[PDB]
Symmetry: D2
Subunit: 269 residues, 4 copies
Amino acid sequence: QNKIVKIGNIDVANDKPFVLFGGMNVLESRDMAMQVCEAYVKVTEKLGVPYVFKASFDKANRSSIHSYRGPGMEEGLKIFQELKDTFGVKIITDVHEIYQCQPVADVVDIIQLPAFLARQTDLVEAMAKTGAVINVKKPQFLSPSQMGNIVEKIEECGNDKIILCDRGTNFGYDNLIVDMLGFSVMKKASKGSPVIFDVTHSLQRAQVTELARSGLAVGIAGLFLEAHPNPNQAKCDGPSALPLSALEGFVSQMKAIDDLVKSFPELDT
Amino acid sequence: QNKIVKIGNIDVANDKPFVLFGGMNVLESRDMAMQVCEAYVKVTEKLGVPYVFKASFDKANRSSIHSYRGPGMEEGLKIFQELKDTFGVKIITDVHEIYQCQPVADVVDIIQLPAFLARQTDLVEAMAKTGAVINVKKPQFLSPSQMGNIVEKIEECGNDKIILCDRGTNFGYDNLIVDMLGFSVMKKASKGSPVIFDVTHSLQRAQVTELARSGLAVGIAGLFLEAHPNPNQAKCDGPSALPLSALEGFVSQMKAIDDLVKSFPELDT
Amino acid sequence: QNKIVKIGNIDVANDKPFVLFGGMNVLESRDMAMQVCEAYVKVTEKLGVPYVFKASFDKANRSSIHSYRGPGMEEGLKIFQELKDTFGVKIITDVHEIYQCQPVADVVDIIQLPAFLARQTDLVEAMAKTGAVINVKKPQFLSPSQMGNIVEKIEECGNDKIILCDRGTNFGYDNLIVDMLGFSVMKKASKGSPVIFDVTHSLQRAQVTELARSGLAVGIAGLFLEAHPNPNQAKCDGPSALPLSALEGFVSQMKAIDDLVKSFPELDT
Amino acid sequence: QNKIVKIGNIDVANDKPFVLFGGMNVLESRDMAMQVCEAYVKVTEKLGVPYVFKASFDKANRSSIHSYRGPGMEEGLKIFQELKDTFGVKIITDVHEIYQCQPVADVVDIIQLPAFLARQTDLVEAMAKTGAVINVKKPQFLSPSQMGNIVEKIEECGNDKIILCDRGTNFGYDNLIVDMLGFSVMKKASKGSPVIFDVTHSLQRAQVTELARSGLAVGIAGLFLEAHPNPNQAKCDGPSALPLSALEGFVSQMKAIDDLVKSFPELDT
């Protein structure tokens, strides 16, 4: 039995129409955030796809201490409040420090637990204690069955509004493969929590569309995607970031595939 | 672009309606071969899906010298000839020894190069010289780029009718993962050879249908599938074989998803 | 050109006598710490092997929020101080939060960056600014060549006193393999930083001794080992902790192997 | 308990002095075979290390039907007979076709089962029926415990004289890692068969010596090595062949490490 996780008036579940958790890598500027959100809002309202805007306010693991890290919490939350006021969008963002959980949860709809920090017990408890909807990013080095333990850890803190997100798994050195069989393993281990597919971070690109179609073909709750007006000038490196102009075409295919797969009766197998 | 490989009146290509290379693991008996072939013929005829019947006549890697391994080539070819005479089906089977290539190619339409023998040069040359269509089984330890080498080796023998078949890739000990991004890589490395997905052997079952849909969602030339009247009573090891009863429903889903994806405008730009 | 990192009067380098970073998983009690530390000092003093006592004061990535996680920093630093006053041992411990770097570096000699937190910039910087020697635990998902980027990051903070520690690499789901060829790669990518082998965490044990000999035969700067008086009763799961009584025989083999290897003239091939 | 496999007056076993199975990739010519064999005989007789000369007579997996692939069986067996007449060496060679097993076994001391063909039941049976000692090359995609099954298959054919050879395991695409823990798994699965390490083919180099030392440090029955008088000019690519001139220094290190490790009493942990 599939669990239903509600994000305002959005219902998230493995057997309901997919939800697009879409945005950009980091809040590069107030202006680019508005432009990116507006483009996604136009595409999703037109196609009738449930939507959650995504963006990070801080980049915790950049290569240098001098690297661009995003605007920081206080400035990022101001930008999120502007997007809520302007477009009425639901928002997802990630948190890296224990003290940020509450202030961020008071503003956004979903808080994301970064893959590298997925087992940091104090952070996971602080996020669950906020009562917000939590998106767990599966570490590339974690078995899909191990997501059951994290769900239990969050649920013991009184919070059951949990979504699970795959971003591929380590395959040799410096390379990633997406295990399409892992989605049902995660569904089974979590007793039905919604599973979503982060296609952008799965691409070790020209193959974003076919990989996204392949993922939705399994029968999942949603798609996590990053885009940018001109990917090559992005402040952070988004080699697999989708050009904003390909969004309409991309989301159109995903609604078509998803609708088709969700219409299939289960096959006695 | 994409190469078109002909199997009589069937056209196999990455941008054409998928071909179902469906059958059973081994020719357990003439009676079961007839039963299985008849079921696939009924389903594929009704839905309008190109079909090639698959079965092995010998199992060359059984665990003991005393293990059941099929009827052998002489009896196996007699069975194949009856299926052709009765149903007019196209046939694919695997060959393990150089001497079998000629006699087998005179009866079937496609000869398959077993994954363990994919780099055995004399066998590759003997198979190529027959002029039959060749199905190359990608070893679970080979990279998708390396398939371009096998294509060149076969083409040096004067035969360009090559289909490539993914069956997953080793992931740790005793486990396989299917790299959905490898299909595009094989297409590129082979200058457009048709790529097919062996779903049943990629299941290191309830996941056969999802995994098959995920593979076809990528946009490929075909699917390789094994079924059995009573899977748990099969003579050899079929961890993942589909009950004959589930065929209609399975094939109906594949055709819908394949037609959908093959109709999408090239999202590229 | 091997770098030499000093820990007080100890010289750590790939071509110097190996240093034993040995202790326990966590500081279970003051009394147990004294016992374990004495066992190691006794053995290393007698055999003439450089020694650094190791133990955690907090287990930040526990199984549950309420299961044992150690004494905490306040009691842990008190226990560490007693060990120094009593034995005059050099000490290594891990830190998980930015605030802990300054108080912990005031007591211990080497601060360890936990593998899961290896790319967290703010923590790396706070540790680097303390001036303490830093042990970098290589994440199970990171390639050996990527250790060079982390060395550059710490050096940008003004600290070049870095040791690299291998604990195995993910191999399929929930399994690890140690790449003995990775030691050479880490040496070249870091421009000669000392490389040490964490044999206890590389074992997912009757094979701890042969694996440790195998690591030292490569020619490396040290070994990281955990032992316990009663491995089966440890508060924290230590399936691979060495029984304390096996220490002298274990270290005796390591010194013999290390000495032999370090005596060989380099064979350029 | 370990099995002892005899090769003439040589005893091969996991707790006996390692045996060097050393030679070249392919019998490039009679004069080079003589040159290489003399070099190994001089070094092993000087150092007192048991020796078996290795060379292939045919390369059955080259990239083209036109590629150089050795002298072939007839001329290769002639060269082996001259090496036995001249130096009195024991010989190991691989066989790739069923018909070759008996003629080759009438000339050499050990026949090797190529890794790619390790599960071809008819070739295994043909080799086993010759009564020759058999070296099983572990496939890069097979787990160590699955070697128990090949041992059983061979013993069922009436031959128990089996040696197991590790050549590393697949790690991602186009890369190999050697699992040093694999050796004791293979010993256990085979009920004590001697296990040897092929360092040459484990190198996906300047690291041949350190990796060889690492494998012998585990405590094994032998080492498999290829060398060449002028490596970058081998007729067949041999990227990891050791220059012949480095043999004495290399074998001198291996004898030292092996003698040390074999002198240690088993540590009770």
